[PDB]
Antibody, heavy 220, light 219 residues
Framework: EVMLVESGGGLVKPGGSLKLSCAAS????????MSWVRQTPEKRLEWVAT????????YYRDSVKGRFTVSRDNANNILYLQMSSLRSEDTALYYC???????????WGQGTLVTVSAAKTTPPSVYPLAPGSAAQTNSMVTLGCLVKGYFPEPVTVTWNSGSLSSGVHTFPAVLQSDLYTLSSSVTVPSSTWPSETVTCNVAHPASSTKVDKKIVPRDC | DLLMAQTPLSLPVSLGDQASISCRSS???????????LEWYLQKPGQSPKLLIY???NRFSGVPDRFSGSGSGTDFTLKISRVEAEDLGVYYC?????????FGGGTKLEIKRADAAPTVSIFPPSSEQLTSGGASVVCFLNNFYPKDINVKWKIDGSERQNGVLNSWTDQDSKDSTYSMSSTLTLTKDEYERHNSYTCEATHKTSTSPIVKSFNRNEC
């Protein structure tokens, strides 16, 4: 039941500015210290900012002081992070977290990704991966979707709007030429495809794009 | 500044066995009050970090007894008395006894399980791509263990490295395996001047190559 949902992430130019928000529910938000914590591309965690329950007192990691402002809306239960003079250093997945005084960061949101770069927003080209030169070993079939040439991270990939998750591998994006490329694979029973619809759902929030791609068998 | 060093960087351990992860700070974490504000977090793959321990040894809500934290001064240890597959991920220590609050760099816990051979599949470039002037061939190598793998591409019998991009997942919780994709990208022009395309792998479980191939003219 405790929920923290961040938004506002995406691409920003070096030296530019952005505002993250974090909507909280199912606890009394206005009586908790709240924090922002980021995770760098090298997977290190860095504390960013903390704000007192009333908003009166704020604390910042040195490297953001004078650049970031943490604030809150205790009526609507929203935590904010205004970010200016952004730098490559600031590229990270940003989490809001409830901070229970000295008893920890107790609850964390899902994170919103911020990429600071002069490259351009590019929506993905999505291509089906239908198996070739195969038909062997076990009774499963593996399918996929190639998600090619997009910027910035992230994308979200589901299969049949989430129903097929248990057979799913989505690979990490590899960066080639200020563009990312990934693939996602789904393995289902040989009985269910091609007799049934398998569809990958790709969302790229930075370009406000969603793509649905039904995987249909190759033929001559 | 106050720095925190974790060791080991990666921790391979078998199910039901014991693991211990250590965190060492560059100065005493004893705050001026006499308290020590050391916490541990677990980030499971694809999730947000989760609090396990606060104030050295107190377990957060829903954290089982088989996790335990101890230490004092500059040396702290998180212990998992009996490792389950769900304990997989990266463990981070964190201090807020001294300014500024800092995390350790993380310890990856790897589950040591039985050997698992890759399921290899090869995917010819969709004809939808080719109008773009490029062609991407994808090869999946799924659900194998250990992570060590040798993947090559051949084109009409000759090896090809130029244009190959590889990516690999983290260990998967459900079965404790790794997966890998390998993608060979050519211009359409070069793609059309070759006929046979081949992804092959060797692994602990298969020293003779696992070979998946297709012909550009087949449909």
């Amino acid at each position: 039941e405790v929920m923290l949902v961040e938004s506002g992430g995406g691409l920003v130019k070096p030296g530019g500015s952005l505002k993250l928000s974090c909507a909280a529910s199912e606890f009394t938000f206005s009586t908790y210290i709240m924090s922002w914590v980021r995770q760098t591309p090298e997977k290190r965690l860095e504390w960013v900012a903390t704000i007192s329950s009333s908003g009166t007192y704020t604390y910042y990691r040195d490297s953001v002081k004078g650049r970031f402002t943490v604030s809150r809306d205790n009526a609507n239960n929203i935590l904010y992070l205004q970010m200016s003079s952004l730098r490559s250093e600031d590229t990270a997945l940003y989490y809001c977290a409830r901070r229970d005084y000295y008893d920890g960061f107790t609850y964390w949101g899902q994170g919103t990704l911020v990429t600071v770069s002069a490259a351009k927003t590019t929506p993905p080209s999505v291509y089906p991966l239908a198996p070739g030169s195969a038909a062997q070993t076990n009774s499963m079939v593996t399918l996929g979707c190639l998600v090619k040439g997009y910027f910035p991270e992230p994308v979200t990939v589901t299969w049949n709007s989430g129903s097929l998750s248990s057979g799913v591998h989505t690979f990490p994006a590899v960066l080639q030429s200020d563009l990312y490329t990934l693939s996602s694979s789904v393995t289902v029973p040989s009985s269910t495809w091609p007799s049934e619809t398998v569809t990958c759902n790709v969302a790229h929030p930075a370009s406000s794009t969603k793509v649905d791609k039904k995987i249909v068998p190759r033929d001559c | 500044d106050l720095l925190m060093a974790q060791t080991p960087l990666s921790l391979p351990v078998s199910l039901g066995d014991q693991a211990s992860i250590s965190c060492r700070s560059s100065q005493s974490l004893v705050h001026s009050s006499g308290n020590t504000y050391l916490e541990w977090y677990l980030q499971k793959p694809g999730q947000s970090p989760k609090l396990l321990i606060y104030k050295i040894s107190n377990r957060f809500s829903g954290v089982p007894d088989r996790f335990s934290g101890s230490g004092s001064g500059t040396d702290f240890t998180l212990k998992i008395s009996r490792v389950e597959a769900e304990d997989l991920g990266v463990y981070y220590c964190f201090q807020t006894s001294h300014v500024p609050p800092t995390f350790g760099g993380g310890t990856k816990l790897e589950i040591k399980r039985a050997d698992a051979a890759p399921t290899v599949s090869i995917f010819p470039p969709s004809s939808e791509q080719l109008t773009s002037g490029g062609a991407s061939v994808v090869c999946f190598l799924n659900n194998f263990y250990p992570k060590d793998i040798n993947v090559k591409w051949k084109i009409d019998g000759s090896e090809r490295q130029n244009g190959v991009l590889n990516s690999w997942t983290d260990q998967d919780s459900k079965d404790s395996t790794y997966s890998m994709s390998s993608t060979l990208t050519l211009t359409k022009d070069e793609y059309e001047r070759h006929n046979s395309y081949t992804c092959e792998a060797t692994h602990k479980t298969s020293t003779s190559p696992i070979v998946k191939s297709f012909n550009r003219n087949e449909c």
